[PDB]
PDB file of all heavy atoms in Angstrom:
ATOM      1  N   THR A   1      77.969  89.400  82.742  1.00 46.16           N
ATOM      2  CA  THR A   1      77.050  89.090  83.877  1.00 46.16           C
ATOM      3  C   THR A   1      77.332  87.556  84.209  1.00 46.16           C
ATOM      4  O   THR A   1      77.455  86.715  83.353  1.00 46.16           O
ATOM      5  CB  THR A   1      75.569  89.174  83.601  1.00 46.16           C
ATOM      6  OG1 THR A   1      74.759  88.766  84.691  1.00 46.16           O
ATOM      7  CG2 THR A   1      75.143  88.592  82.356  1.00 46.16           C
ATOM      8  N   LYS A   2      77.313  87.292  85.482  1.00 44.60           N
ATOM      9  CA  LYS A   2      77.513  85.957  86.149  1.00 44.60           C
ATOM     10  C   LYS A   2      76.363  85.848  87.066  1.00 44.60           C
ATOM     11  O   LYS A   2      76.059  86.660  87.935  1.00 44.60           O
ATOM     12  CB  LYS A   2      78.807  85.724  86.790  1.00 44.60           C
ATOM     13  CG  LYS A   2      79.055  84.330  87.259  1.00 44.60           C
ATOM     14  CD  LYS A   2      79.295  83.350  86.171  1.00 44.60           C
ATOM     15  CE  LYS A   2      79.309  81.984  86.674  1.00 44.60           C
ATOM     16  NZ  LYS A   2      77.964  81.419  87.247  1.00 44.60           N
ATOM     17  N   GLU A   3      75.748  84.549  87.079  1.00 40.72           N
ATOM     18  CA  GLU A   3      74.699  84.338  88.005  1.00 40.72           C
ATOM     19  C   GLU A   3      75.169  83.987  89.461  1.00 40.72           C
ATOM     20  O   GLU A   3      76.188  83.351  89.576  1.00 40.72           O
ATOM     21  CB  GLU A   3      73.802  83.103  87.546  1.00 40.72           C
ATOM     22  CG  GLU A   3      72.672  83.438  86.565  1.00 40.72           C
ATOM     23  CD  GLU A   3      71.571  84.183  87.227  1.00 40.72           C
ATOM     24  OE1 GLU A   3      71.740  85.362  87.475  1.00 40.72           O
ATOM     25  OE2 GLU A   3      70.559  83.517  87.572  1.00 40.72           O
ATOM     26  N   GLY A   4      74.581  84.580  90.306  1.00 39.03           N
ATOM     27  CA  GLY A   4      74.761  84.301  91.813  1.00 39.03           C
ATOM     28  C   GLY A   4      75.775  85.067  92.414  1.00 39.03           C
ATOM     29  O   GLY A   4      76.287  84.899  93.570  1.00 39.03           O
ATOM     30  N   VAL A   5      76.373  86.069  91.733  1.00 38.80           N
ATOM     31  CA  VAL A   5      77.456  87.059  92.313  1.00 38.80           C
ATOM     32  C   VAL A   5      76.849  88.359  92.442  1.00 38.80           C
ATOM     33  O   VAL A   5      76.235  88.959  91.679  1.00 38.80           O
ATOM     34  CB  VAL A   5      78.715  87.067  91.392  1.00 38.80           C
ATOM     35  CG1 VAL A   5      79.382  85.700  91.362  1.00 38.80           C
ATOM     36  CG2 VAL A   5      78.308  87.588  90.083  1.00 38.80           C
ATOM     37  N   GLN A   6      76.881  88.863  93.752  1.00 37.31           N
ATOM     38  CA  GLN A   6      76.470  90.244  94.032  1.00 37.31           C
ATOM     39  C   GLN A   6      77.259  91.239  93.242  1.00 37.31           C
ATOM     40  O   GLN A   6      76.614  92.218  92.726  1.00 37.31           O
ATOM     41  CB  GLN A   6      76.504  90.375  95.589  1.00 37.31           C
ATOM     42  CG  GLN A   6      76.208  91.858  95.983  1.00 37.31           C
ATOM     43  CD  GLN A   6      74.566  92.153  96.130  1.00 37.31           C
ATOM     44  OE1 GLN A   6      73.825  91.115  96.023  1.00 37.31           O
ATOM     45  NE2 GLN A   6      74.159  93.307  96.259  1.00 37.31           N
ATOM     46  N   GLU A   7      78.538  91.047  93.234  1.00 39.16           N
ATOM     47  CA  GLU A   7      79.388  92.065  92.501  1.00 39.16           C
ATOM     48  C   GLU A   7      79.384  91.814  91.048  1.00 39.16           C
ATOM     49  O   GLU A   7      79.342  90.835  90.540  1.00 39.16           O
ATOM     50  CB  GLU A   7      80.774  92.084  93.121  1.00 39.16           C
ATOM     51  CG  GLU A   7      81.008  92.807  94.322  1.00 39.16           C
ATOM     52  CD  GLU A   7      80.481  92.024  95.550  1.00 39.16           C
ATOM     53  OE1 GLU A   7      80.349  90.713  95.357  1.00 39.16           O
ATOM     54  OE2 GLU A   7      80.206  92.623  96.565  1.00 39.16           O
ATOM     55  N   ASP A   8      79.340  93.017  90.345  1.00 40.15           N
ATOM     56  CA  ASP A   8      79.534  93.080  88.911  1.00 40.15           C
ATOM     57  C   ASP A   8      80.926  92.665  88.443  1.00 40.15           C
ATOM     58  O   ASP A   8      81.776  92.661  89.359  1.00 40.15           O
ATOM     59  CB  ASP A   8      79.047  94.327  88.301  1.00 40.15           C
ATOM     60  CG  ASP A   8      78.938  94.221  86.767  1.00 40.15           C
ATOM     61  OD1 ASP A   8      79.979  94.047  86.105  1.00 40.15           O
ATOM     62  OD2 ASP A   8      77.837  94.437  86.183  1.00 40.15           O
ATOM     63  N   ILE A   9      81.198  92.444  87.243  1.00 38.75           N
ATOM     64  CA  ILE A   9      82.557  92.259  86.732  1.00 38.75           C
ATOM     65  C   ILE A   9      83.469  93.383  87.112  1.00 38.75           C
ATOM     66  O   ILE A   9      84.661  93.300  87.534  1.00 38.75           O
ATOM     67  CB  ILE A   9      82.643  91.877  85.168  1.00 38.75           C
ATOM     68  CG1 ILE A   9      81.754  90.728  84.932  1.00 38.75           C
ATOM     69  CG2 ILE A   9      84.089  91.673  84.778  1.00 38.75           C
ATOM     70  CD1 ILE A   9      82.189  89.427  85.651  1.00 38.75           C
ATOM     71  N   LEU A  10      82.963  94.608  87.042  1.00 38.90           N
ATOM     72  CA  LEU A  10      83.733  95.813  87.388  1.00 38.90           C
ATOM     73  C   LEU A  10      84.241  95.807  88.850  1.00 38.90           C
ATOM     74  O   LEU A  10      85.308  96.092  89.212  1.00 38.90           O
ATOM     75  CB  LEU A  10      82.924  97.093  87.113  1.00 38.90           C
ATOM     76  CG  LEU A  10      82.603  97.346  85.632  1.00 38.90           C
ATOM     77  CD1 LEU A  10      81.991  98.828  85.538  1.00 38.90           C
ATOM     78  CD2 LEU A  10      83.841  97.429  84.722  1.00 38.90           C
ATOM     79  N   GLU A  11      83.249  95.429  89.731  1.00 37.70           N
ATOM     80  CA  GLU A  11      83.507  95.454  91.167  1.00 37.70           C
ATOM     81  C   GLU A  11      84.693  94.346  91.410  1.00 37.70           C
ATOM     82  O   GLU A  11      85.453  94.642  92.280  1.00 37.70           O
ATOM     83  CB  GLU A  11      82.320  95.299  91.918  1.00 37.70           C
ATOM     84  CG  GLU A  11      81.411  96.545  92.063  1.00 37.70           C
ATOM     85  CD  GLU A  11      80.935  96.884  93.351  1.00 37.70           C
ATOM     86  OE1 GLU A  11      80.932  95.888  94.241  1.00 37.70           O
ATOM     87  OE2 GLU A  11      80.056  97.903  93.558  1.00 37.70           O
ATOM     88  N   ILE A  12      84.471  93.201  90.943  1.00 37.45           N
ATOM     89  CA  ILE A  12      85.544  92.090  91.280  1.00 37.45           C
ATOM     90  C   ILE A  12      86.809  92.543  90.668  1.00 37.45           C
ATOM     91  O   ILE A  12      87.859  92.219  91.244  1.00 37.45           O
ATOM     92  CB  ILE A  12      84.969  90.814  90.751  1.00 37.45           C
ATOM     93  CG1 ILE A  12      84.735  90.736  89.367  1.00 37.45           C
ATOM     94  CG2 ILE A  12      83.715  90.447  91.492  1.00 37.45           C
ATOM     95  CD1 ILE A  12      84.274  89.458  88.717  1.00 37.45           C
ATOM     96  N   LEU A  13      86.863  93.114  89.394  1.00 37.69           N
ATOM     97  CA  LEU A  13      88.189  93.575  88.955  1.00 37.69           C
ATOM     98  C   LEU A  13      88.754  94.613  89.836  1.00 37.69           C
ATOM     99  O   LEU A  13      89.902  94.663  89.957  1.00 37.69           O
ATOM    100  CB  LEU A  13      87.927  94.032  87.532  1.00 37.69           C
ATOM    101  CG  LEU A  13      87.599  93.068  86.363  1.00 37.69           C
ATOM    102  CD1 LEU A  13      88.043  93.656  85.119  1.00 37.69           C
ATOM    103  CD2 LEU A  13      88.425  91.789  86.377  1.00 37.69           C
ATOM    104  N   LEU A  14      87.918  95.614  90.350  1.00 39.81           N
ATOM    105  CA  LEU A  14      88.445  96.579  91.345  1.00 39.81           C
ATOM    106  C   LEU A  14      88.989  95.900  92.495  1.00 39.81           C
ATOM    107  O   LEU A  14      90.055  96.206  92.982  1.00 39.81           O
ATOM    108  CB  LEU A  14      87.240  97.550  91.719  1.00 39.81           C
ATOM    109  CG  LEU A  14      86.875  98.580  90.608  1.00 39.81           C
ATOM    110  CD1 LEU A  14      85.705  99.362  91.171  1.00 39.81           C
ATOM    111  CD2 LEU A  14      88.020  99.548  90.311  1.00 39.81           C
ATOM    112  N   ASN A  15      88.282  94.842  93.072  1.00 39.55           N
ATOM    113  CA  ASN A  15      88.769  94.051  94.288  1.00 39.55           C
ATOM    114  C   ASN A  15      90.113  93.526  93.996  1.00 39.55           C
ATOM    115  O   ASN A  15      90.953  93.637  94.844  1.00 39.55           O
ATOM    116  CB  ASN A  15      87.718  93.130  94.824  1.00 39.55           C
ATOM    117  CG  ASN A  15      86.396  93.841  95.262  1.00 39.55           C
ATOM    118  OD1 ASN A  15      86.520  94.852  95.912  1.00 39.55           O
ATOM    119  ND2 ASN A  15      85.292  93.412  94.864  1.00 39.55           N
ATOM    120  N   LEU A  16      90.209  92.837  92.794  1.00 41.80           N
ATOM    121  CA  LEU A  16      91.511  92.180  92.435  1.00 41.80           C
ATOM    122  C   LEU A  16      92.605  93.291  92.341  1.00 41.80           C
ATOM    123  O   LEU A  16      93.743  93.010  92.565  1.00 41.80           O
ATOM    124  CB  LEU A  16      91.354  91.455  91.209  1.00 41.80           C
ATOM    125  CG  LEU A  16      90.691  90.063  91.292  1.00 41.80           C
ATOM    126  CD1 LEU A  16      90.324  89.598  89.948  1.00 41.80           C
ATOM    127  CD2 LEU A  16      91.656  89.078  92.046  1.00 41.80           C
ATOM    128  N   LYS A  17      92.292  94.435  91.792  1.00 39.49           N
ATOM    129  CA  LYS A  17      93.152  95.500  91.511  1.00 39.49           C
ATOM    130  C   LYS A  17      93.953  95.931  92.833  1.00 39.49           C
ATOM    131  O   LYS A  17      95.117  96.053  92.913  1.00 39.49           O
ATOM    132  CB  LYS A  17      92.570  96.769  90.951  1.00 39.49           C
ATOM    133  CG  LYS A  17      93.639  97.686  90.297  1.00 39.49           C
ATOM    134  CD  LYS A  17      92.943  98.607  89.194  1.00 39.49           C
ATOM    135  CE  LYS A  17      91.895  99.649  89.900  1.00 39.49           C
ATOM    136  NZ  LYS A  17      92.703 100.495  90.763  1.00 39.49           N
ATOM    137  N   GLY A  18      93.204  96.025  93.992  1.00 38.35           N
ATOM    138  CA  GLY A  18      93.752  96.381  95.258  1.00 38.35           C
ATOM    139  C   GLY A  18      94.279  95.066  96.041  1.00 38.35           C
ATOM    140  O   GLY A  18      94.663  95.167  97.220  1.00 38.35           O
ATOM    141  N   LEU A  19      94.244  93.911  95.407  1.00 36.99           N
ATOM    142  CA  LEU A  19      94.581  92.698  96.081  1.00 36.99           C
ATOM    143  C   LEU A  19      96.243  92.783  96.137  1.00 36.99           C
ATOM    144  O   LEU A  19      96.928  92.387  95.150  1.00 36.99           O
ATOM    145  CB  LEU A  19      94.217  91.467  95.243  1.00 36.99           C
ATOM    146  CG  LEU A  19      94.767  90.105  95.815  1.00 36.99           C
ATOM    147  CD1 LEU A  19      93.922  89.750  97.127  1.00 36.99           C
ATOM    148  CD2 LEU A  19      94.320  88.981  94.736  1.00 36.99           C
ATOM    149  N   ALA A  20      96.799  93.103  97.252  1.00 40.51           N
ATOM    150  CA  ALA A  20      98.214  93.240  97.458  1.00 40.51           C
ATOM    151  C   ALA A  20      98.774  91.842  97.528  1.00 40.51           C
ATOM    152  O   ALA A  20      98.352  91.002  98.203  1.00 40.51           O
ATOM    153  CB  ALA A  20      98.421  93.965  98.744  1.00 40.51           C
ATOM    154  N   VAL A  21      99.650  91.633  96.627  1.00 40.23           N
ATOM    155  CA  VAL A  21     100.350  90.302  96.481  1.00 40.23           C
ATOM    156  C   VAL A  21     101.961  90.526  96.452  1.00 40.23           C
ATOM    157  O   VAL A  21     102.427  91.400  95.865  1.00 40.23           O
ATOM    158  CB  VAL A  21      99.858  89.600  95.231  1.00 40.23           C
ATOM    159  CG1 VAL A  21     100.754  88.416  94.836  1.00 40.23           C
ATOM    160  CG2 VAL A  21      98.479  89.107  95.346  1.00 40.23           C
ATOM    161  N   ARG A  22     102.567  89.593  97.165  1.00 37.46           N
ATOM    162  CA  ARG A  22     104.098  89.605  97.245  1.00 37.46           C
ATOM    163  C   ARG A  22     104.571  88.270  96.617  1.00 37.46           C
ATOM    164  O   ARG A  22     104.050  87.199  96.959  1.00 37.46           O
ATOM    165  CB  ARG A  22     104.539  89.780  98.647  1.00 37.46           C
ATOM    166  CG  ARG A  22     106.154  89.962  98.627  1.00 37.46           C
ATOM    167  CD  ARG A  22     106.526  90.016 100.028  1.00 37.46           C
ATOM    168  NE  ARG A  22     105.743  90.758 100.996  1.00 37.46           N
ATOM    169  CZ  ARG A  22     105.412  90.347 102.203  1.00 37.46           C
ATOM    170  NH1 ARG A  22     105.922  89.203 102.682  1.00 37.46           N
ATOM    171  NH2 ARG A  22     104.543  91.065 102.896  1.00 37.46           N
ATOM    172  N   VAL A  23     105.565  88.344  95.624  1.00 36.44           N
ATOM    173  CA  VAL A  23     105.982  87.227  94.980  1.00 36.44           C
ATOM    174  C   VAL A  23     107.560  87.074  95.091  1.00 36.44           C
ATOM    175  O   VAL A  23     108.194  88.194  95.239  1.00 36.44           O
ATOM    176  CB  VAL A  23     105.418  87.084  93.580  1.00 36.44           C
ATOM    177  CG1 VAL A  23     105.798  85.791  92.865  1.00 36.44           C
ATOM    178  CG2 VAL A  23     103.979  87.226  93.506  1.00 36.44           C
ATOM    179  N   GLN A  24     107.944  85.922  94.874  1.00 40.66           N
ATOM    180  CA  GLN A  24     109.522  85.666  94.964  1.00 40.66           C
ATOM    181  C   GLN A  24     110.088  85.968  93.620  1.00 40.66           C
ATOM    182  O   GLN A  24     109.530  86.679  92.810  1.00 40.66           O
ATOM    183  CB  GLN A  24     109.743  84.301  95.363  1.00 40.66           C
ATOM    184  CG  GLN A  24     109.269  83.809  96.760  1.00 40.66           C
ATOM    185  CD  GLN A  24     109.833  84.657  97.795  1.00 40.66           C
ATOM    186  OE1 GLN A  24     110.887  85.390  97.701  1.00 40.66           O
ATOM    187  NE2 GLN A  24     109.206  84.509  99.063  1.00 40.66           N
ATOM    188  N   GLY A  25     111.341  85.674  93.451  1.00 40.09           N
ATOM    189  CA  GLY A  25     112.039  86.071  92.209  1.00 40.09           C
ATOM    190  C   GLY A  25     111.359  85.743  90.923  1.00 40.09           C
ATOM    191  O   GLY A  25     111.597  86.449  89.873  1.00 40.09           O
ATOM    192  N   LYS A  26     110.461  84.784  90.969  1.00 39.56           N
ATOM    193  CA  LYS A  26     109.771  84.543  89.666  1.00 39.56           C
ATOM    194  C   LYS A  26     108.877  85.649  89.346  1.00 39.56           C
ATOM    195  O   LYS A  26     108.287  86.290  90.099  1.00 39.56           O
ATOM    196  CB  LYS A  26     108.824  83.280  89.996  1.00 39.56           C
ATOM    197  CG  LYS A  26     107.837  82.871  88.964  1.00 39.56           C
ATOM    198  CD  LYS A  26     107.508  81.453  88.835  1.00 39.56           C
ATOM    199  CE  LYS A  26     107.015  80.892  90.357  1.00 39.56           C
ATOM    200  NZ  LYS A  26     106.000  81.612  90.899  1.00 39.56           N
ATOM    201  N   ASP A  27     108.926  85.992  87.984  1.00 40.38           N
ATOM    202  CA  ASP A  27     108.273  87.169  87.659  1.00 40.38           C
ATOM    203  C   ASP A  27     106.740  87.111  87.570  1.00 40.38           C
ATOM    204  O   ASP A  27     106.123  87.922  88.271  1.00 40.38           O
ATOM    205  CB  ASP A  27     108.916  87.562  86.206  1.00 40.38           C
ATOM    206  CG  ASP A  27     110.334  87.789  86.260  1.00 40.38           C
ATOM    207  OD1 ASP A  27     111.094  86.696  86.211  1.00 40.38           O
ATOM    208  OD2 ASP A  27     110.835  88.931  86.295  1.00 40.38           O
ATOM    209  N   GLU A  28     106.328  86.242  86.715  1.00 40.76           N
ATOM    210  CA  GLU A  28     104.891  86.058  86.474  1.00 40.76           C
ATOM    211  C   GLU A  28     104.376  84.791  87.048  1.00 40.76           C
ATOM    212  O   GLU A  28     105.043  83.713  86.765  1.00 40.76           O
ATOM    213  CB  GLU A  28     104.430  86.184  85.001  1.00 40.76           C
ATOM    214  CG  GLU A  28     105.183  85.296  84.111  1.00 40.76           C
ATOM    215  CD  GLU A  28     104.662  85.293  82.684  1.00 40.76           C
ATOM    216  OE1 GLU A  28     103.548  85.742  82.493  1.00 40.76           O
ATOM    217  OE2 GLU A  28     105.321  84.749  81.780  1.00 40.76           O
ATOM    218  N   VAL A  29     103.225  84.695  87.633  1.00 43.16           N
ATOM    219  CA  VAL A  29     102.632  83.574  88.363  1.00 43.16           C
ATOM    220  C   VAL A  29     101.123  83.619  88.261  1.00 43.16           C
ATOM    221  O   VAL A  29     100.518  84.747  88.294  1.00 43.16           O
ATOM    222  CB  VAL A  29     103.120  83.134  89.618  1.00 43.16           C
ATOM    223  CG1 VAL A  29     102.688  84.381  90.612  1.00 43.16           C
ATOM    224  CG2 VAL A  29     102.542  82.000  90.191  1.00 43.16           C
ATOM    225  N   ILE A  30     100.530  82.450  88.035  1.00 42.62           N
ATOM    226  CA  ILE A  30      99.019  82.327  87.871  1.00 42.62           C
ATOM    227  C   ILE A  30      98.487  81.631  89.103  1.00 42.62           C
ATOM    228  O   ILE A  30      98.911  80.498  89.356  1.00 42.62           O
ATOM    229  CB  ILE A  30      98.713  81.639  86.584  1.00 42.62           C
ATOM    230  CG1 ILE A  30      97.040  81.749  86.303  1.00 42.62           C
ATOM    231  CG2 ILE A  30      99.108  80.128  86.584  1.00 42.62           C
ATOM    232  CD1 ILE A  30      96.767  81.518  84.940  1.00 42.62           C
ATOM    233  N   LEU A  31      97.515  82.276  89.794  1.00 44.28           N
ATOM    234  CA  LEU A  31      96.887  81.787  90.928  1.00 44.28           C
ATOM    235  C   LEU A  31      95.382  81.435  90.551  1.00 44.28           C
ATOM    236  O   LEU A  31      94.881  81.914  89.594  1.00 44.28           O
ATOM    237  CB  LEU A  31      96.830  82.705  92.139  1.00 44.28           C
ATOM    238  CG  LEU A  31      98.238  83.145  92.692  1.00 44.28           C
ATOM    239  CD1 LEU A  31      98.810  84.249  91.689  1.00 44.28           C
ATOM    240  CD2 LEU A  31      98.115  83.614  94.097  1.00 44.28           C
ATOM    241  N   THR A  32      94.892  80.434  91.226  1.00 43.63           N
ATOM    242  CA  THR A  32      93.436  80.000  91.089  1.00 43.63           C
ATOM    243  C   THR A  32      92.596  80.218  92.152  1.00 43.63           C
ATOM    244  O   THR A  32      93.065  80.061  93.346  1.00 43.63           O
ATOM    245  CB  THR A  32      93.371  78.476  90.669  1.00 43.63           C
ATOM    246  OG1 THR A  32      94.008  77.833  91.712  1.00 43.63           O
ATOM    247  CG2 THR A  32      94.220  78.259  89.400  1.00 43.63           C
ATOM    248  N   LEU A  33      91.371  80.705  91.875  1.00 44.70           N
ATOM    249  CA  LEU A  33      90.378  80.956  92.898  1.00 44.70           C
ATOM    250  C   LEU A  33      89.100  80.160  92.539  1.00 44.70           C
ATOM    251  O   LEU A  33      88.502  80.444  91.511  1.00 44.70           O
ATOM    252  CB  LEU A  33      90.125  82.374  93.183  1.00 44.70           C
ATOM    253  CG  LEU A  33      88.987  82.750  94.212  1.00 44.70           C
ATOM    254  CD1 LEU A  33      89.510  82.670  95.656  1.00 44.70           C
ATOM    255  CD2 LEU A  33      88.371  84.124  93.908  1.00 44.70           C
ATOM    256  N   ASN A  34      88.746  79.119  93.415  1.00 44.68           N
ATOM    257  CA  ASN A  34      87.473  78.363  93.154  1.00 44.68           C
ATOM    258  C   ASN A  34      86.751  78.245  94.450  1.00 44.68           C
ATOM    259  O   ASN A  34      87.344  77.929  95.565  1.00 44.68           O
ATOM    260  CB  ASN A  34      87.946  76.911  92.641  1.00 44.68           C
ATOM    261  CG  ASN A  34      88.267  76.879  91.226  1.00 44.68           C
ATOM    262  OD1 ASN A  34      87.921  77.678  90.413  1.00 44.68           O
ATOM    263  ND2 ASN A  34      89.131  75.982  90.743  1.00 44.68           N
ATOM    264  N   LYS A  35      85.472  78.578  94.418  1.00 41.28           N
ATOM    265  CA  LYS A  35      84.719  78.565  95.635  1.00 41.28           C
ATOM    266  C   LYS A  35      83.192  78.453  95.267  1.00 41.28           C
ATOM    267  O   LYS A  35      82.700  79.243  94.267  1.00 41.28           O
ATOM    268  CB  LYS A  35      85.013  79.726  96.674  1.00 41.28           C
ATOM    269  CG  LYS A  35      84.459  79.352  97.934  1.00 41.28           C
ATOM    270  CD  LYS A  35      84.523  80.580  98.883  1.00 41.28           C
ATOM    271  CE  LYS A  35      84.641  80.240 100.355  1.00 41.28           C
ATOM    272  NZ  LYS A  35      84.065  81.290 101.272  1.00 41.28           N
ATOM    273  N   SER A  36      82.402  77.807  96.078  1.00 40.50           N
ATOM    274  CA  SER A  36      80.924  77.778  95.969  1.00 40.50           C
ATOM    275  C   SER A  36      80.420  77.929  97.308  1.00 40.50           C
ATOM    276  O   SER A  36      81.073  77.482  98.346  1.00 40.50           O
ATOM    277  CB  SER A  36      80.381  76.528  95.345  1.00 40.50           C
ATOM    278  OG  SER A  36      79.075  76.420  95.321  1.00 40.50           O
ATOM    279  N   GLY A  37      79.202  78.558  97.494  1.00 37.95           N
ATOM    280  CA  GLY A  37      78.514  78.688  98.630  1.00 37.95           C
ATOM    281  C   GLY A  37      78.346  80.246  98.973  1.00 37.95           C
ATOM    282  O   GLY A  37      79.064  81.067  98.452  1.00 37.95           O
ATOM    283  N   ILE A  38      77.142  80.423  99.741  1.00 36.61           N
ATOM    284  CA  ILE A  38      76.824  81.897 100.098  1.00 36.61           C
ATOM    285  C   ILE A  38      77.873  82.460 101.088  1.00 36.61           C
ATOM    286  O   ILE A  38      78.238  81.813 101.988  1.00 36.61           O
ATOM    287  CB  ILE A  38      75.428  81.925 100.686  1.00 36.61           C
ATOM    288  CG1 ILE A  38      74.433  81.162  99.690  1.00 36.61           C
ATOM    289  CG2 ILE A  38      74.973  83.331 100.897  1.00 36.61           C
ATOM    290  CD1 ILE A  38      73.013  81.139 100.401  1.00 36.61           C
ATOM    291  N   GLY A  39      78.329  83.656 100.699  1.00 38.51           N
ATOM    292  CA  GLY A  39      79.251  84.402 101.480  1.00 38.51           C
ATOM    293  C   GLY A  39      80.369  85.210 100.846  1.00 38.51           C
ATOM    294  O   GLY A  39      80.407  85.262  99.552  1.00 38.51           O
ATOM    295  N   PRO A  40      81.156  85.795 101.639  1.00 37.58           N
ATOM    296  CA  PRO A  40      82.369  86.405 101.036  1.00 37.58           C
ATOM    297  C   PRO A  40      83.439  85.488 100.481  1.00 37.58           C
ATOM    298  O   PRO A  40      83.481  84.385 100.807  1.00 37.58           O
ATOM    299  CB  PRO A  40      82.979  87.218 102.265  1.00 37.58           C
ATOM    300  CG  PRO A  40      81.827  87.240 103.340  1.00 37.58           C
ATOM    301  CD  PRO A  40      81.124  85.898 103.069  1.00 37.58           C
ATOM    302  N   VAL A  41      84.153  86.081  99.440  1.00 36.19           N
ATOM    303  CA  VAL A  41      85.390  85.385  98.851  1.00 36.19           C
ATOM    304  C   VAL A  41      86.552  86.097  99.248  1.00 36.19           C
ATOM    305  O   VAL A  41      86.881  87.106  98.562  1.00 36.19           O
ATOM    306  CB  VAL A  41      85.132  85.085  97.483  1.00 36.19           C
ATOM    307  CG1 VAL A  41      86.392  84.531  96.848  1.00 36.19           C
ATOM    308  CG2 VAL A  41      83.965  84.243  97.107  1.00 36.19           C
ATOM    309  N   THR A  42      87.218  85.745 100.444  1.00 32.53           N
ATOM    310  CA  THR A  42      88.254  86.588 100.862  1.00 32.53           C
ATOM    311  C   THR A  42      89.601  86.141 100.020  1.00 32.53           C
ATOM    312  O   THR A  42      89.624  85.194  99.231  1.00 32.53           O
ATOM    313  CB  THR A  42      88.599  86.327 102.344  1.00 32.53           C
ATOM    314  OG1 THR A  42      88.800  85.010 102.623  1.00 32.53           O
ATOM    315  CG2 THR A  42      87.400  86.726 103.088  1.00 32.53           C
TER     316      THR A  42
END
């Protein structure tokens, strides 16, 4: 559980699962998502 998030961990993992991403020849890459404030996180 996380405070202030409408979605449970399951739902955010589901959303990330469908997050279509295209990457260059580099095999594995780590991206960061940081945000505060009421609303969607696109």
